[PDB]
Amino acid sequence: LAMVDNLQGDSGRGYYLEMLIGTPPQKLQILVDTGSSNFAVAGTPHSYIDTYFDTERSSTYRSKGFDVTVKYTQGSWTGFVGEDLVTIPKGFNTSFLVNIATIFESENFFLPGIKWNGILGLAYATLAKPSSSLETFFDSLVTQANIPNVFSMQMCGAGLPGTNGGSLVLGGIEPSLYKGDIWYTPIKEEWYYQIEILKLEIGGQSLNLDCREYNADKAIVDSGTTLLRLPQKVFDAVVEAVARASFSDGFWTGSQLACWTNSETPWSYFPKISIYLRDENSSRSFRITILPQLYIQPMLNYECYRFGISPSTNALVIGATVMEGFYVIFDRAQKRVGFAASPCAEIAGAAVSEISGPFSTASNCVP
Numbered sequence: 208l209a210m211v212d213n214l215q216g217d218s219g220r221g222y223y224l225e226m227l228i229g230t231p232p233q234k235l236q237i238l239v240d241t242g243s244s245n246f247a248v249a250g251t252p253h254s255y256i257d258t259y260f261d262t263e264r265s266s267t268y269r270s271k272g273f274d275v276t277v278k279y280t281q282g283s284w285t286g287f288v289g290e291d292l293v294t295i296p297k298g299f300n301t302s303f304l305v306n307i308a309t310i311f312e313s314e315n316f317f318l319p320g321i322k323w324n325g326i327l328g329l330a331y332a333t334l335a336k337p338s339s340s341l342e343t344f345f346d347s348l349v350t351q352a353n354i355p356n357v358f359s360m361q362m363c364g365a366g367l368p369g370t371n372g373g374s375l376v377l378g379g380i381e382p383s384l385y386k387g388d389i390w391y392t393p394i395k396e397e398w399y400y401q402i403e404i405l406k407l408e409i410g411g412q413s414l415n416l417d418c419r420e421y422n423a424d425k426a427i428v429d430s431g432t433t434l435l436r437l438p439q440k441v442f443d444a445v446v447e448a449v450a451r452a453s454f455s456d457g458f459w460t461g462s463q464l465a466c467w468t469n470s471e472t473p474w475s476y477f478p479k480i481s482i483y484l485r486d487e488n489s490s491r492s493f494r495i496t497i498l499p500q501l502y503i504q505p506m507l508n509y510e511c512y513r514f515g516i517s518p519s520t521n522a523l524v525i526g527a528t529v530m531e532g533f534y535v536i537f538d539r540a541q542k543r544v545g546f547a548a549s550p551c552a553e554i555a556g557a558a559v560s561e562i563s564g565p566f567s568t569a570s571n572c573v574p
């Protein structure tokens with residue numbers, strides 16, 4: 208469809224989509240975020256962003272009468288909850304009527320180097336603010352364009368933070384954006400896009416951790432989270448395993464980069480990490496494997512990288528760094544998350560991620 212390469216960005220600061228808003232249309236760039244389910248834009252100005260949304264100059268704007276605050280793991284913001292007409296040049300050409308928040312105060316939400324100026328929440332209504340009545344952007348498109356309740360991403364920016372992008376397909380799958388077969392894990396709770404992680408295998412070496420700690424609170428697919436966050440002590444074990452292949456110092460914690468003359472690639476010094484996820488039938492499972500290329504992030508005859516895994520307190524987040532390796536399908540209608548190899552996820556024309564299945568299975572791992 209026309210929806211291919213409608214995204215643009217990297218894993219460092221995010222992937223965004225060009226949207227037209229209001230009457231007449233204001234050209235905004237909207238971060239795509241499967242970790243939240245609120246659609247919001249910058250209603251007043253700010254320094255890292257270069258364009259904002261002017262509600263005065265949109266006659267099709269209407270205010271709903273209340274403000275709302277949204278707090279994320281990174282930053283927060285408060286905005287008027289209006290609604291307005293939105294048009295996505297790529298794929299639709301039609302105007303849609305959607306709730307929208309215009310942000311008039313943001314704390315640590317607009318970071319340096321962002322090229323976007325709003326956020327689009329593609330998660331379930333459960334996470335909407337101030338409640339579940341605010342109808343998500345994507346829920347409106349389903350109900351208004353009688354498209355299927357399905358979207359699918361492809362992020363090809365597996366290089367280094369001009370930035371090549373990817374595709375956001377609304378209404379289903381674009382089969383030129385993957386190769387091979389698709390493995391579907393079910394959605395364990397239709398709030399975040401929570402899935403059931405069965406195992407972690409660090410370079411052939413299963414983790415000693417209990418299966419239950421991987422889904423300690425939730426294990427989610429979050430296009431808004433840059434990295435692969437892990438529950439703290441899961442991270443620790445993971446860190447030791449990777450370290451053992453070579454505790455509590457700067458690179459792992461991200462306060463230092465490691466730099467190599469451009470010729471040497473450190474990736475072979477690291478191990479492939481495998482996430483084993485449950486297939487749609489209990490008995491089976493499968494694994495998505497990101498190689499060192501994805502988690503050793505490069506941020507010219509030398510290159511300077513960072514360890515691309517950070518520790519979380521409650522949740523395990525499959526951020527965009529893990530999602531860049533694959534084509535991700537968010538099938539909300541059959542409550543599943545689909546994974547497949549992504550052709551554009553190929554540095555030097557070699558595969559940077561792999562997907563393999565099936566496998567034999569604890570009884571339940573979600574507490």
Ligand SMILES: CCC[C@H](O)[C@H](NC[C@@H]1Cc2cccc(c2)CCCCc2cc(cc(N(CCC)S(C)(=O)=O)c2)C(=O)N1)C(=O)NCC(C)C
Pocket residue numbers: 219220221240242243244277278279280281282315316317334427429431432433434435436517522524526
């Ligand atoms: C799982 C719970 C929610 C999930 O976290 C979800 N993640 C998506 C958010 C969205 C967001 C907001 C502001 C700025 C960004 C994006 C920029 C992306 C790049 C930096 C980044 C972002 C997040 C998160 C990180 N990282 C964690 C550090 C705080 S990191 C460095 O990649 O590991 C970096 C993050 O939380 N993005 C969330 O935060 N909140 C959802 C509720 C409000 C509904």
